[PDB]
Amino acid sequence: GFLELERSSGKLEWSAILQKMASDLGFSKILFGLLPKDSQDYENAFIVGNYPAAWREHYDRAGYARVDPTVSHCTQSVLPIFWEPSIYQTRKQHEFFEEASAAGLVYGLTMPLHGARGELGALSLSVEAENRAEANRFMESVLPTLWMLKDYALQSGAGLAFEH
Amino acid sequence: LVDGFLELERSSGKLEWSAILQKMASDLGFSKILFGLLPKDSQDYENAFIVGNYPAAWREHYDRAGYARVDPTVSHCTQSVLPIFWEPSIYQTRKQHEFFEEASAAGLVYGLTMPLHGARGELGALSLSVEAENRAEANRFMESVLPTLWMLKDYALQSGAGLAF
Ligand SMILES: COc1ccccc1C(=O)Oc1c(Br)cc(Br)cc1CNC(=O)c1ccccc1[N+](=O)[O-]
Numbered sequence: 201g202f203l204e205l206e207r208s209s210g211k212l213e214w215s216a217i218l219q220k221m222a223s224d225l226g227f228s229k230i231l232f233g234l235l236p237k238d239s240q241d242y243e244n245a246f247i248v249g250n251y252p253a254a255w256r257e258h259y260d261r262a263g264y265a266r267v268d269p270t271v272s273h274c275t276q277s278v279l280p281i282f283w284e285p286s287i288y289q290t291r292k293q294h295e296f297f298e299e300a301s302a303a304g305l306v307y308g309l310t311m312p313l314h315g316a317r318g319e320l321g322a323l324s325l326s327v328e329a330e331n332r333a334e335a336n337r338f339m340e341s342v343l344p345t346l347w348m349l350k351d352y353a354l355q356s357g358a359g360l361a362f363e364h
Numbered sequence: 365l366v367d368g369f370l371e372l373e374r375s376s377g378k379l380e381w382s383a384i385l386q387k388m389a390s391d392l393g394f395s396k397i398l399f400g401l402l403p404k405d406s407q408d409y410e411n412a413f414i415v416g417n418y419p420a421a422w423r424e425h426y427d428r429a430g431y432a433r434v435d436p437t438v439s440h441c442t443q444s445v446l447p448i449f450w451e452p453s454i455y456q457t458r459k460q461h462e463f464f465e466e467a468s469a470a471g472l473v474y475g476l477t478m479p480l481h482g483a484r485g486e487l488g489a490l491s492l493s494v495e496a497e498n499r500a501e502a503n504r505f506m507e508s509v510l511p512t513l514w515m516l517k518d519y520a521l522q523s524g525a526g527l528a529f
């Protein structure tokens with residue numbers, strides 16, 4: 201639980217616990233990103249997780265926070281956004297989909313994080329699967345548990361990220 | 365839920381939105397609800413956007429007694445995205461004990477409050493009361509529906525922000 205996240209000491213232990221919870225839910229890859237109130241500085245977000253480091257670096261270098269459609273979505277909504285063909289509309293967004301798929305990140309969802317002190321973030325989780333249909337079933341069967349998890353991760357994470 | 369969300373989105377205005385949300389809560393097992401929402405950087409609880417079916421006299425009293433300064437769920441909501449259950453432990457001060465007695469007298473004895481923190485800085489709460497024989501039976505019931513309610517509150521927030529502002 202959150203209890204586990206709260207008792208942990210430091211960022212390494214907290215990332216290992218979150219990765220495990222997410223793995224227990226069927227997601228082998230995650231990225232928890234968090235910004236303080238009023239910040240839009242995506243290249244200096246507090247980040248936890250196990251996305252391939254080269255993909256994280258590429259995301260930063262290419263400035264993909266400008267193109268990633270889950271980014272504009274999180275600024276407008278508290279609801280999850282599933283990684284579906286229909287969210288990638290522009291040339292640049294299709295390149296995005298293609299580079300992210302080359303990293304293994306093809307199916308998944310992004311849960312926006314909106315903290316009590318105005319923190320802005322996302323918990324993105326990717327699921328390994330044969331097609332869209334299978335990925336959807338796996339994501340749907342755990343969605344109530346993920347929906348709680350994202351809020352526990354935010355409440356715990358905000359303190360990890362910003363309390364020094 | 366997603367059906368409910370679209371119904372909320374497709375609703376005509378506050379009256380139909382309130383009726384839909386009330387019934388979602390009722391179908392899930394909760395008798396009374398209160399959905400409250402403030403815009404970014406407001407602490408004017410007396411003039412929040414409010415939906416629901418708490419007794420009118422109770423709502424009036426809460427406003428006249430300045431209970432937004434007392435109600436322990438209000439401080440809680442400004443500090444967390446996690447639910448606060450209406451446990452004896454949350455009423456710490458003398459004034460909070462009086463608050464509990466008055467809410468209880470209104471029928472509002474067991475329940476929980478889900479903080480709402482919107483994408484544009486909206487601050488709110490979805491509070492739901494449950495009718496039950498005693499606390500242990502209420503808590504059993506709340507634990508069985510909590511994952512559904514957790515989803516519900518975010519749907520209600522996102523739609524409600526759209527209606528209110
Ligand atoms: C504070 O942080 C944020 C705040 C509001 C929103 C996002 C965030 C964030 O964390 O954004 C990032 C950052 Br920064 C780096 C990387 Br790498 C990835 C993301 C988020 N996007 C994805 O994970 C995504 C989404 C869809 C398909 C594939 C992917 N994917 O990347 O594979």
Ligand SMILES: COc1ccccc1C(=O)Oc1c(Br)cc(Br)cc1CNC(=O)c1ccccc1[N+](=O)[O-]
Pocket residue numbers: 398399400401402409410412413418422423426432435437438441450467472477487488489491
């Ligand atoms: C924008 O609105 C808000 C914004 C951030 C937080 C709360 C709110 C809100 O809606 O606060 C209110 C308001 Br305003 C009026 C009334 Br009446 C009730 C509440 C909420 N409190 C309860 O429902 C509650 C809680 C525990 C025991 C009994 C009760 N109870 O009242 O029976």
